């Protein structure tokens, strides 16, 4: 499941760096980034369907690889706190992406 593990790593890394990029749009000309994020979340839905639990067993085991790509533990804990306040957890993260995509 090494391809599966690096896919989850890239999913969390791109989720965090799209959270950072949409911070300008969320806090009130970035419509190019909005349609790009919509195409990105549709691509991730299609890729998850091409492939096809809880946070503390499944999302918390890809901490090291994602944190080598990113190196900011506070952003990881903000992501985890937002998913904890929202509620396998892949469906939870994708539902979070759909709810952020429409707004």
């Amino acid at each position: 499941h090494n391809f599966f593990e690096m896919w989850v790593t890239y999913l969390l890394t791109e989720t965090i760096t799209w959270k950072d990029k949409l911070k300008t749009c969320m806090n009130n000309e970035c419509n190019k980034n909005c349609v790009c994020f919509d195409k990105w979340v549709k691509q991730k839905e299609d890729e998850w369907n091409s492939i096809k639990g809880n946070i503390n067993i499944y999302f918390e085991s890809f901490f090291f690889h994602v944190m080598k790509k990113l190196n900011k533990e506070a952003k990881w804990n903000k992501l985890m706190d937002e998913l904890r306040n929202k509620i396998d957890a892949i469906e939870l993260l994708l539902e979070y992406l759909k709810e952020k995509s429409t707004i």
Partner: antibody
Amino acid sequence: QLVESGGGLAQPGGSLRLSCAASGFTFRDHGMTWVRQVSGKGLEWLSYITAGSKMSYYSDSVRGRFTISRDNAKNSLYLQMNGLTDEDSAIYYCVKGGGNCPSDTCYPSGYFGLDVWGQGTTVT
Amino acid sequence: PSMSVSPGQTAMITCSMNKYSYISWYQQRPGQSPALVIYQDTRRPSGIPERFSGSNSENTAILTITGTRDLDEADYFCQGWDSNVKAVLFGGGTKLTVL
């Protein structure tokens, strides 16, 4: 369970090596840590090594002065020192680095913590 | 520093580091190696009871010990992390005196 050897007495100078062998643990895919502790004082992290032994971190006082390398076959980790002074008289605990280590991306965070601490040997 | 806390009450041990990292805690029995108590700021391994609780909010790491016992005489160290210098920052530790 961690077993230790190599501690004792040292004059100022170098050439003193400790050993720590991991018994009953999965030494191949876990990180490994050594932390010293002066008696009556607190902990002080010195060196860390990843699962694949391709990355290693050190403190600001022991970087380059100390060295560390692991043998994944016999499951024994050594710590080698040079230039010992009077401030290095501490209790050196060999520590299993907590977590699971996907590939060699290991670093001793407080996230996974440092789960298993050995008994350690006294360095004078 | 230290806090003289009577047995059975709540101890509030703070490091209050400005940069956020996941803070672990260790119960160092005297003459004994430390052991992992709380990791990922909420979680806890098997073999230790539920009474050790922790959190880190508003840049302050609080290890809430509910029901402090005589066996809790230990120096409790924060385990930080600094990704800028790649060196872990152990806390100074507090001699949590149990009366």
